């Protein structure tokens, strides 16, 4: 290839960081540790992939360049550009099977693999499209991503639901014990549609958001384009639970309390909870919440807090990590909890906003 380009170091760093995102540490095939570089019509394109998702970055070329393509080791190329001085001019060209990188009197020769061998995600057609602010998408994901399963046997839970309904985009994430749902109006009449994005893809999309975000959804893929970055991922094929069925039906108990005071009380009680099961006991009556935690060493923590409470006295158990995850995600003043009994789910939300809702299933104590 006759590929050649010269670009300032600072125009390459974020593109390189972004496209190395899909790349896992131990690639099965050597090419999968590489980035695809392509020079065409005044643009340098950089692509990184793990076969399930890909990230593409486009860099404008104002200095002399020649068209062509090659693949180079991602981490080595990034480290070289990063390690060069601020303001360095990075000259790249091919010399047989090597890619030569030159700046000042620093010279690097990287091994390449043919561009023709680089994998491409199969051709696909978009069937749903919409645009929204990148911060709105980031908020939708941030509000719910901690509730995704990690490596659950129920593959469809190891990801996030993206659902359009009326004028809202909604994200739902659950691991079967706790659930998070967040809706945001996006100002367009949308078709009712729902897809599951794999968790690795959700994390990658979240990391690309910092320009509007253009989203395209196909039968088996999702694409997000923002600025000079394009992210594409395969979707998870399966049926996602219905959050509407999970929300507590007729909660007869309502608790309100300060978010930080609740979170610090749960965090101290957690210290003396069972390291494996993480169970804490909530006793609520007479506008007082008592949190107790015991462990196999027979140690005990007890926190008493003033709360606003309506409903019968009740004792209910929770995995303290699930509660702390919810309180950490709600970065608010007051939280509202809606309960029914010791064996039923509890709904938690910001006392002042209904945009996000969290459902936590209790444990027996």
């Amino acid at each position: 290839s006759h590929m050649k380009f010269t670009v300032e170091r600072e125009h390459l760093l974020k593109p390189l960081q972004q496209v190395s995102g899909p790349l896992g540490g131990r690639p099965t095939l050597p090419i999968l540790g590489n980035l695809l570089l392509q020079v065409a019509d005044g643009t340098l394109s950089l692509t990184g992939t793990d076969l399930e998702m890909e990230m593409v970055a486009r860099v404008a070329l104002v200095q002399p360049h020649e068209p062509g393509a090659t693949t180079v080791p991602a981490r080595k190329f990034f480290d070289i550009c990063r390690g060069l001085p601020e303001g360095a001019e990075i000259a790249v060209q091919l010399e047989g099977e090597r890619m030569l990188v030159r700046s000042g009197r620093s010279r690097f020769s990287l091994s390449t693999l043919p561009a023709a061998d680089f994998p491409n995600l199969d051709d696909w057609q978009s069937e749903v499209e919409f645009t929204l602010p990148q911060a709105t998408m980031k908020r939708l994901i941030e509000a719910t991503q901690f509730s995704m399963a990690h490596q659950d046997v129920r593959y469809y839970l190891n990801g996030m639901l993206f659902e359009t309904e009326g004028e809202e985009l909604r994200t739902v994430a659950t691991d079967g014990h706790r659930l998070a749902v967040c809706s945001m109006p996006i100002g367009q009449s949308l078709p009712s549609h729902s897809v599951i994005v794999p968790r690795k893809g959700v994390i990658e999309l979240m990391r690309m958001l910092d320009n509007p975000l253009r989203v395209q959804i196909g039968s088996n893929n999702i694409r997000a384009h923002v600025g000079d970055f394009i992210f594409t991922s395969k979707l998870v094929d399966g049926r996602f639970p219905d959050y509407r069925r999970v929300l507590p039906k007729n909660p007869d108990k309502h608790l309100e309390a300060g978010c930080d005071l609740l979170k610090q009380a749960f965090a101290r009680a957690a210290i003396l909870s069972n390291e494996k099961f993480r169970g804490v006991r909530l006793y609520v009556s007479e506008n007082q919440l008592k949190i107790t935690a015991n462990n196999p060493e027979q140690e005990e923590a007890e926190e008493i807090l003033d709360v606003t409470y309506s409903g019968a006295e009740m004792e209910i158990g929770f995995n303290v990590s699930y509660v702390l995850d919810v309180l950490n995600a709600l970065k608010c003043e007051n939280v509202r909890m809606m309960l029914t009994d010791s064996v039923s789910s509890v709904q938690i939300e910001d006392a002042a906003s209904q945009s996000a809702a969290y459902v936590v299933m209790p444990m027996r104590l």
């Binding site: 659950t174 079967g176 014990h177 706790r178 659930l179 639970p241 069925r245 999970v246 099961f277 995995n319 064996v343 789910s345 459902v359 299933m361 209790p362 444990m363 027996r364």
Partner: peptide
């Protein structure tokens, strides 16, 4: 730990 669904 009880299940949501």
């Amino acid at each position: 730990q009880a299940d949501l669904f």
